[PDB]
Symmetry: D2
């Protein structure tokens, strides 16, 4: 039993964008860099439960959660109350100047929540990119080795190094280099497009062989991978792939970094997606869902790695902001109290079965995949695995016109993803999935 | 009657006290040793010119969280704006579903930054991210690879911002290899440069080296702080920056003023670039912008900022709507209270006291800075040999006396003053007197 | 052919013998341990198909000093040209005072390389320097930063050529960090790729990855060996290279054929590119060019080669007049004796013997190559699992029997044949019979 | 000494003449425009102090092919050794089948380089390859990433040696991005540095910057030319190099003396390091080593050179046996004729003439260099403003008079003298007089 602040309804009753959104768009185009861009042409005034309400009073079904961020809802009252309260005491002291309990609380929670029973420590930053940057810093300093491996279909951020680590050039990297050195890309696992029948273990062995031939373990500080590749297309590795990699890394003194920026915090039907794989990452990176929408990120890793860095080596002015920490303590509480991991598993069950039935009735769905509330359909030309990015975009755009916000992704631009807030109601989620299904049938 | 906390220095327990000590045991068990903190006490409230710790001690705050809480660390208008926005939405991702608060901040920054030309803004979370994105814009817009940064510079802790940062320890050491095609040049450091060197000559020396070693046709950008912050509050010789900007303009090189620390009233103007009469092609901002909340900005010529293809400037959290609400409020407070004028008054009163102290002792090599960004460089008597150990000792003794004062510098020997601009005259005077007494004792 | 030395295999002392042993003691006391040598005997003469050591042993030379002494290691016309030029001048620095010998080599190479289009040449000393300068031309001419190299590639031992080289040990390990904006892609390796994979499809896979991860607009050059040499004498599937060159041409990307090892009669044509029907934008050359002397060349489209400002391509020694005289003489010998035809005859006779041998034993996974650049890949029986130890043991046993045969391979399990093309039928037959007997002994 | 060619100037056709003109047409049709040549005439013979062109003109050679043909460009012992080796074998690849000639050169260089400690050598083809391999040894042996090079340095035209080289045009521009973790530092340039700056202080300034910006624990190597060649024949202030080598030793940093240009009799000693009293950990060599043939060498402490795993230093052609035979012969000639002593005599006589000339004109800012590596820096009268255009015009006019003289310099305003050491006194004098007359005419 969840109580909502806003009516959980889809309501589209003006042109899109409406008049007030249009006036805002004119101001936006006059003031904001064209390099930014936005998926939706409407401007938000409220977001609660499973809806976004725009400046003209339209109410959209939110199947994006701000790209997997507002897992607890975009204005959860406990999160809002924690934010307001902390801000009355202090917005900022800089933890590296005058520390505070809120940062310590978050570190404690994350140390306990991440995989493994071993001794761990945490450092907090603002963005997921900063978390990745700092995990790489820890691995390089602790091992004394220079190279880092990242994978095909990877996405890790928009800083120079996280661009280096990211696989796709457009729109993340193109014209923004040259890039941070000693980053090597390897093949990972992509079941749909890899050789038929390839096992996870064999996919891992092929990557290991390439690493040994082309880099050498003695020069490799770290392997970084997303347990489910997010922007690359919600790619779930073949069973056995990740465990095979982690075993090799452990044998070779290489730090294994699981990038759980998108998969972390209930999203995949577990606290962390690494749990489904049985792996215990040496370092985990986190952001998005952590703080109920506020800018917080985290690096949680084996104590001996995290404490290898000299005092002052991990830094930043804002990181572990006390208001964002208060938001995180509250958001993590909500996840526990409402058992949002269980809710994600319920969503996997109901949505995957609907999408699988839809795939049998049309010919444009190449695969239904994902876990928990991180689910996707890959869109292809009938009778092939040829990507159809144009159709993907058209489906997403038609859904928006019908009042349902659905994101896309993928190395080839042809994946419709589903990232609802986990506090969405059954009826509104069903309405959104039905609207999408009708659009897919119409296109097929 | 107006402040929320008592504007008093109150030290009535050992430091750290018992509640801080218990928090510190927790902190050492949970938080990476790579982080570290200046103070051993844990904050529960910060307001006006004070920080109150978990044991009820009250410290005079001459750091502002490293130049961040310019409007105070819990300004009630900032607090109310944060609270209010959070009830509506914490986040939609501006790149997914946009919102007015981001647009408002962009409008405010386009208006506030130097120059009357057409500008656009993009928002991120940290100062390092702002610098990263300024470099991305310059590189894409010019089609050129190289970037120049300077001796004594500091720009952040990401791989590229480490590359752009001069000092290795603790910012860079063991964290490379670093982003390529970054070239370091000499800038202006009047105390330590050749006696009588003009800013124009210092700039011509840098320009000559740039032309010889890089070539304008390969250079996307020159990035410099108008007053170098972590490097030691180094104010360039007059004429230096204008000489550089003129060359950059003539050669199609993007000039980026990194105002992350200097920006927003701090130096007695909205931006420190104003003192120099320069109009930077791009300005980077963070710290003071949002009254303590994590927001950063890149404001630049429209033709540069709009050269980037849609989706090329990105990030999930950037321009967070709660942080934007905070910024709108914080910028309002700066205007309403005329905090630039306040910084100018602080410059006048504090610089004269510090200059008098410098004549009285023999360990102050220079008093420098502008507005409420003021510093003394500590040296061995009769020399300009840095004394970092003494610098550290003075700051630690100040802390034991209830006054939080930060240090910095390429050579670790600069005591800096970064008060919140809402500090009262009497409490600021008390803090400066306590510092002066400690400096006299050490000299 | 008249030979200077008796074309006989003669092993009549311990190996190494006493005089080689005294040289080896001096060598260990004076020469870096980082260098290393395959053979423990010290050369005093090399002619036709033999190497005569300091103790009078005569070895059958199936290596040609790693594909260098194609015209033989002391051809009298090459020696005469070297002697004559040294009497006039050893060096003036072509960039200071030019000379006809450099111009003559440039003219010969412009004529001999693929295509009828306008070309220019620049001369250097080593193959690595040629590759460096081909990359310099491509980067300057295109104004683009990135370069693509491939799995199994080898291009040299300078920092950038190490970057371009795939295998870490012993070429790269501990010698970084490496030159930036080098990206590695899969090429074609028929034995180890998916069974049935066409060259066109292998090329499409590389192209897709290049488009996704780099973007043509950032790509100055693709560099590939037409037959990968140190990587294991890997011949691409038919259609692979043409598919690449077509894409490169369409996208303004400079295509560089690294013919340092394949060049000059070696593969049964002047250039291996001819077998593929491709016309590279730039060709890099060294090894066989100057009958053993240190010369290398970059020959490319005039518009590319002349895009570089005067003084931008340089070096003190490059196009050394004595080495140029050697090259004019060597190229003359290749023409006069029709060494490409001789390479074709060696392919016919040796490939059929080696293929018969492969049916008789169970440790030969593949016989491959073209002309006199031929290889057998050694595997564990009934598998494609590499056997580097056995490969090494075969080569070592051959050396003990007076036959110098080199190895190579990404996995260290390729026995290669690189005879001088002036070897006699009888001595070549003897060498192959000795190798076969050893392989038969090991297959039991 | 007896010569093969007439030791005189002979200018009896237009320059270029008809045969050189025909060759130049062929050259422009066949050779990349990126190469370029100083002289428009084509060589058929070079011997002693002269170069004879395709039309029978004879030039006084004051360049030695850029400091290469120190023993003369066709010394008969060198030519005979070359001929003789080629009849036995041109190449076996030392890494496949080794040979005595490589061992002989390694032994000679181990003995000749500074210090009495245990050393080993590896051979390559070019000076750039020697520098590449010295950096490889230093990085592997120390396990550290960074390399320091200096203002005004030149080390070669490969990607990494371009990175190490200071001047962009024509060595680097548009050829990047460059090998990472190369840091440039100031060295010593007496003419243009602060008046009175000591070498020790110049080194202390570089050391300070290194410690601040890199940290010894990340620094594999410092590489410097004992006299910077292409940068303008810059001789460091006394004490500079020794101060650096002391610091490197104390901090585990490999010090590499790049003697590619200074090496082998050129500066009045076997190696220019001798004049400075330093013992470099690694020396790089090429140019004069093999009497014009393509050989280069890396000679270093045994513990450093042998730290590299077998096969880690390589190349197909390196230590070519014909080039090794040339080197044994050339080094023999240098010993037999005491060419280091000859270089000291040249220094004495030429420096005194050039210094007198500098007193008489107003366009020579400095006379500098050692041995037969001598230079005049050309400036605008009453200033140190470079005059590159005048420098070029002097060299061009000398060529028209039958004297081949090279230029160089960071600012393109240095006339250099690099004669072969077998040039006769009368011909060298004639060359210097022709140059002097031209310089007088210009002043």
């Amino acid at each position: 039993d969840i109580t909502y602040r806003l009516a959980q309804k889809r309501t589209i009753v003006t042109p899109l964008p409406g008049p007030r959104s249009g006036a805002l768009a004119e101001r936006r185009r006059a003031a904001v860099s064209a390099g930014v861009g936005s998926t939706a042409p409407v401007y938000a005034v409220d977001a609660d439960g499973g809806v976004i309400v725009d400046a003209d009073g339209n109410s959209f079904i939110d199947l994006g959660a701000g790209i997997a961020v507002t897992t607890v809802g975009a204005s959860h009252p406990a999160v809002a109350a924690a934010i307001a309260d902390q801000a009355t005491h202090f917005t900022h002291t800089c933890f590296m100047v005058t520390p505070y309990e809120q940062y310590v609380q978050v570190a404690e929670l994350l140390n306990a929540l991440t995989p493994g029973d071993h001794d761990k420590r945490t450092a907090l930053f603002n963005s997921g990119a900063e978390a990745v940057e700092n995990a790489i810093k820890v691995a390089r300093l602790a091992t004394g080795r220079p190279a880092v491996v990242a994978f095909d279909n990877a996405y890790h951020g928009r800083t120079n190094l996280t661009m280096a680590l990211t696989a796709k050039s457009m729109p993340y990297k193109s014209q923004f280099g040259p890039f941070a050195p000693e980053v090597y890309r390897m093949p990972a696992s992509y079941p749909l497009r890899d050789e038929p029948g390839l096992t996870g273990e064999e996919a891992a062995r092929r990557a290991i062989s390439r690493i040994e031939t082309q880099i050498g373990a003695q020069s490799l500080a770290a392997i970084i991978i997303e347990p489910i590749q997010g922007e690359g297309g919600f790619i779930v590795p073949a069973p056995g792939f990740l465990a095979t990699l982690t075993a090799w890394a452990s044998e070779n003194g290489v730090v294994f970094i699981a990038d759980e920026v998108q998969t972390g915090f209930a999203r995949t039907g577990a606290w962390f997606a690494s749990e489904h794989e049985g792996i215990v990452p040496d370092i985990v990176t986190m952001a998005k869902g952590i703080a109920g929408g506020m800018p917080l990120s985290a690096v949680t890793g084996r104590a001996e790695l995290m404490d290898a860095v000299y005092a002052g080596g991990l830094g930043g002015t804002y990181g572990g902001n006390p208001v964002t920490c208060a938001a995180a303590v509250a958001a993590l509480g909500v996840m526990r109290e409402l058992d949002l991991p269980a809710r994600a598993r319920a969503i996997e069950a109901s949505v995957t079965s609907r999408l699988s039935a839809l795939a049998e009735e049309v010919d444009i769905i190449g695969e239904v995949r994902g876990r928990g509330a991180m689910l996707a359909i890959e869109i292809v030309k009938p009778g092939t695995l040829e990507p159809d990015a144009a159709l993907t975009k058209s489906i997403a755009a038609e859904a928006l016109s019908q009042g349902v916000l659905i994101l896309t992704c993928g190395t080839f631009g042809n994946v419709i993803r589903l990232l609802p807030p986990l506090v969405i109601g059954d009826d509104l989620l069903d309405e959104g999935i039905t609207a999408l299904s009708d659009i897919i049938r119409a296109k097929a």
